[PDB]
Amino acid sequence: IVGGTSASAGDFPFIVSISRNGGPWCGGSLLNANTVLTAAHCVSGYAQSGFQIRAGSLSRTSGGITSSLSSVRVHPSYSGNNNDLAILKLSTSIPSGGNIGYARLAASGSDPVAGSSATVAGWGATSEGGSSTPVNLLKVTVPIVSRATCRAQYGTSAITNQMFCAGVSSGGKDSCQGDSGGPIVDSSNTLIGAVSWGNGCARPNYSGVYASVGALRSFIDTYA
């Protein structure tokens, strides 16, 4: 996260860190006791055993409850950046309670409205290309950017109905490398997306692009 502040305990009861090979990698959202939602690109085709999920902590490396993966399923229409969601099943069930809880999802067919305020969180880099990453979870609030403006930035084909965008014209507030798969929420803390892609991090006039939960509810609901 670029331009962020430290998340408080219980800000995102459902957020998980996704370590790979023991190191930082992605974020995700706990949907129920054995299921995590993340970005497809975080997991597609990689060795599943390399991943470890942790819930209930502001750190990636201690606290809360861990699990390995039992299975990975990417969206059936995943291609390039499009439809960038995956359902992970957990080898160890994780109970709600305390600072762990399960996400509530954006309604099927909803689309975040330009100008509304979204909050994204993760353990990723604090500058584009940064090597070091924070121990504790960061968050940042950015407005939704219309799909039309986002298509002006990236091209028409590049931004689909299964993506939405968020950021500020001046840049300086965004998700970055290592934040992929983690949550973006609306002002009510309803999960509206997963961190997906963008042109660098926090650049002027290049929004962050997010996989849209409201657009992708059939997949999520079927396999969660």
Side-chain angles (χ1 to χ4, degrees):
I1 301 289
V2 180
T5 64
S6 307
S8 296
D11 276 355
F12 309 98
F14 56 83
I15 195 171
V16 302
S17 60
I18 305 184
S19 296
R20 185 184 171 213
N21 295 317
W25 185 246
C26 279
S29 297
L30 192 64
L31 298 187
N32 60 57
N34 310 200
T35 310
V36 166
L37 185 67
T38 190
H41 79 262
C42 288
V43 292
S44 184
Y46 295 129
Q48 294 184 13
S49 57
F51 297 107
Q52 186 181 60
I53 278 49
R54 183 185 302 277
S57 187
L58 296 173
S59 173
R60 181 183 64 81
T61 54
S62 62
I65 304 296
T66 62
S67 183
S68 66
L69 300 185
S70 61
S71 66
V72 174
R73 181 184 297 269
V74 306
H75 192 284
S77 302
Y78 181 47
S79 180
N81 298 140
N82 198 17
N83 307 315
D84 191 13
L85 290 181
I87 288 285
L88 318 183
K89 297 292 178 173
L90 301 184
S91 305
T92 302
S93 305
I94 302 182
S96 63
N99 284 312
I100 300 175
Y102 306 137
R104 293 299 299 267
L105 302 178
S108 177
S110 67
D111 185 18
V113 176
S116 65
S117 171
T119 300
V120 57
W123 290 271
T126 60
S127 64
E128 183 181 327
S131 291
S132 289
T133 63
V135 166
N136 280 8
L137 183 63
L138 293 174
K139 64 180 185 180
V140 68
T141 297
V142 282
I144 303 301
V145 171
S146 70
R147 186 170 299 91
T149 292
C150 205
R151 286 174 171 158
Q153 299 174 342
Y154 290 100
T156 299
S157 296
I159 313 299
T160 70
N161 290 347
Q162 306 82 225
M163 297 172 194
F164 73 88
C165 301
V168 293
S169 66
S170 63
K173 289 182 168 205
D174 202 357
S175 51
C176 198
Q177 281 53 64
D179 293 320
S180 290
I184 179 165
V185 297
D186 70 11
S187 59
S188 306
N189 286 325
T190 303
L191 185 67
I192 59 171
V195 175
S196 180
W197 66 280
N199 183 28
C201 308
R203 297 192 180 182
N205 298 310
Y206 288 94
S207 303
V209 191
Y210 297 87
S212 179
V213 166
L216 296 170
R217 283 294 298 272
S218 188
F219 170 68
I220 297 167
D221 296 349
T222 296
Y223 295 108

